Design a protein around this ligand. Structure first.
Ligand code: APC
Ligand code: APC
Ligand code: MN
Ligand code: MN
Lengths: 176, 176
């Protein structure tokens, strides 16, 4: 379900979890992972070299699913690739050797559902509240156009409205 | 078997493969991989940033074992860390995003054996000949001299003499 170099996404603040969950129930959404605590360590060079290029690099641990990912996001906000990793500390030390060191951490509760080709990701962050992201994976930049708007069609059928859209990343929201 | 941020290693030209193999049987070596094709893609930044720090970074595929490794050697002597990865192409693209691109590729045939704490590799490189590496990984910097001396003793035991020692790396031997 996670194949491709691009994650076409639309993110929204969620005003009621009840109606969101009813729609998930309505549309026969498949649960992939539910209520995982996700801890994301963001790494950068000592002069913020990656952020100066619109790139984020993260080591993510998700519990209790046990999933560990190395993620490189950017440049831009569709480009995203990740790799499952066995050992977060081994990868972190290897990256430190290359000059990347922890810069900050973002924690969240996350659930991920599927409806056909769409991912619906439901997040809760301590300060900030509830969010949902509609996303579609692709490997072909030559098809990015259709997908977004389609995340918009799906989001339109889903009760996630423009007035609630949130274009900022979590690092942007948190001042990192 | 492959635990540590330090790797003590001695590489030898092999003048007599028959003696080496006969000693592998006599010493009850266990084969970890036999006659694998190993393709190593060396990666660096456009300005050779890693080489300038005596760091090498490799994505290795070994067939038919199916082992895939991301390896960061250095900076300088005796430092090496590796992680298993599921997909070379995927990590390669991730590293390309960070600015590291294929600089050159080395191919070889390699068998890897264990005798107690020691690793013995038997390599053949088409333009160059037959080599064997004797190696021990550790996290402890205080024993590196002892371990290297143990490797040299161990090697003599396979008919690999002090005078067949090869301090140059394959990348150096191949003009990279
Ligand atoms: N279990 C899994 N296996 C493989 N890849 C996965 C995965 N779970 C997620 N991914 C991939 O890794 C990417 C991670 O990106 P996101 O989770 O969207 C960052 P985020 O925390 O939402 O922050 P942002 O809004 O601040 O950018 C996903 O787009 C997806 O492609
Ligand atoms: N299956 C595995 N799991 C984890 N680590 C491994 C592994 N196989 C090998 N490694 C580690 O990664 C290192 C890779 O380095 P080498 O294979 O020595 C590069 P090389 O091709 O020999 O050229 P060189 O001449 O520069 O040494 C190994 O020495 C080993 O310590
Ligand atoms: Mn996201
Ligand atoms: Mn070697």
């Amino acid at each position: 379900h996670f194949v491709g170099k691009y994650e076409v996404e639309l993110k929204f603040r969620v005003m009621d979890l009840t109606t969101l969950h009813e729609q998930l129930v309505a549309q026969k959404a498949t649960a992939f992972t539910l209520n995982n605590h996700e801890k994301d360590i963001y790494l950068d060079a000592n002069g913020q070299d990656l952020a100066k290029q619109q790139i984020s690099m993260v080591l993510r641990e998700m519990n209790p699913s046990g999933i560990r990912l190395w993620i490189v996001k950017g440049p831009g906000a569709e480009r995203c690739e990740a790799s499952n990793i066995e050992d977060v500390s081994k990868v972190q030390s290897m990256l430190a050797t290359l000059g990347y060191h922890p810069a900050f951490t973002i924690e969240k509760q996350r659930s991920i559902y599927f409806v056909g080709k769409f991912h619906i990701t439901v997040d809760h962050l301590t300060g900030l509240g509830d969010f949902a992201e509609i996303a579609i994976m692709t490997d072909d930049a030559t098809e990015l156009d259709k997908l977004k708007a389609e995340c918009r069609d799906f989001a339109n059928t889903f009760g996630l409205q423009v007035d609630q859209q949130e274009p900022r990343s979590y690092r942007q929201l948190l001042g990192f």
